[PDB]
Ligand binder design. Structure first.
Ligand SMILES: Cn1c(=O)n(C)c2cc(S(=O)(=O)N3CCC4(CC3)CC(NCc3ccc(-c5ccccc5)c(Cl)c3)C4)ccc21
Length: 329
């Protein structure tokens, strides 16, 4: 009789109540701007689906970031553009400024607002407990916004977060895997980077929702507070879930698969074994202690749950005591 269905606990019906054009991205028509408005200055990054450059708009001498896509399906270009346009002006969401057709690749190039980006040497070294809480709050602002606007990011990870520490500014980037949440929809589980994949992806439960991003956030927090990047260090997708189970325990895992009547790939029964749920104190040492507090562990514990329906929402996360000092200020 197959897997038990699931719905988001929050922002369930938000896309239903919008006009079709908001989420029916296949009907979105893309208008091109002038590629010659932009001169490329230097390469910043190269990343599987795209290359990223710093550029100058010669029309007005503004500095800009250009993301030249590798060949992708038109429908996925339209989804990313549509989501970027829908979320534009929202808290800590990267701003799409223009879309042009590259003369060499004949592929699209997305043009973004420039955000100055501080080295991961200056940061991650005298990044204080306060700083982690502050920037986590800022990420939660972006996720609560995008979730409220009917959109899961599905690729939350440090590579997709930019911080300008001089200006205490943060941006969530790389919306190319984001999707619109619709109740009853089965999504592709072949998303996210392995270290950040939620258990639902790993056990092939397709009827997932915004709560996927909350697992990913949990991975990032763990990694920051225990100074262990990545926290769940799988050697492949099967072992990824073994790494998770060596911490969260197998008991809650088997309960999760029972509740949703999930069919476990029999590969997994050779390898999952039996494991205790571990106390978070086993990952605390003197070299990470200043980042770890009762309220951080309580928060982390409530993000990293197998059952996606039982993880904090972005809003609930923002209300957690971990953040009382940052909200006060
Ligand atoms: C505007 N624009 C775009 O749209 N794209 C695609 C673009 C691509 C580029 S890039 O390639 O030069 N490149 C920029 C540098 C990074 C990698 C990417 C490193 C990553 N940030 C790491 C990070 C992330 C999170 C944290 C953190 C700290 C505390 C609490 C929570 C989290 C900390 Cl401590 C660090 C950002 C540039 C502009 C772009």
């Amino acid at each position: 009789s197959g897997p038990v269905p699931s719905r988001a606990r929050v922002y369930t019906d938000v896309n239903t109540h919008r006009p079709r054009e908001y989420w029916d991205y296949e009907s979105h028509v893309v208008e091109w701007g002038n590629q010659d408005d932009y001169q490329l200055v230097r390469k910043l990054g190269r990343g599987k689906y795209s290359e990223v450059f710093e550029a100058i708009n010669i029309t007005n001498n503004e500095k800009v970031v250009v993301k030249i896509l590798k060949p992708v399906k038109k429908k996925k270009i339209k989804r990313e553009i549509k989501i970027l346009e829908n979320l534009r002006g929202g808290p800590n969401i990267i701003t799409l400024a223009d879309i042009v057709k590259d003369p060499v690749s004949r592929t699209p190039a997305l043009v973004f607002e420039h955000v100055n980006n501080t080295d991961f040497k200056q940061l991650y070294q005298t990044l204080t407990d306060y700083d982690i809480r502050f920037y986590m709050y800022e990420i939660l602002k972006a996720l609560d916004y995008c979730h409220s606007m009917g959109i899961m990011h599905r690729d939350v990870k440090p590579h997709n977060v930019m911080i300008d520490h001089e200006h205490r500014k943060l941006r969530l980037i790389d919306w190319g895997l984001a999707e619109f949440y619709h109740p009853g929809q089965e999504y592709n589980v072949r998303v996210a980077s392995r270290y950040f994949k939620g258990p639902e992806l790993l056990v092939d439960y397709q009827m997932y929702d915004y709560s996927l991003d909350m697992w990913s956030l949990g991975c990032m927090l763990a990694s920051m507070i225990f100074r262990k990047e990545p926290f769940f260090h799988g050697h492949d997708n099967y072992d990824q879930l073994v790494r998770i189970a060596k911490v969260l325990g197998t008991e809650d895992l088997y309960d999760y698969i029972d509740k949703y009547n999930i069919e476990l790939d029999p590969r997994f029964n050779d390898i999952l074994g039996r494991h205790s749920r571990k106390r978070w104190e086993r990952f605390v040492h003197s070299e990470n202690q200043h980042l770890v507090s009762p309220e951080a562990l309580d928060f982390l514990d409530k993000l990293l749950r197998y059952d996606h329906q039982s993880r904090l929402t972005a809003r609930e996360a923002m209300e957690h005591p971990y953040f009382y000092t940052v909200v006060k200020d």
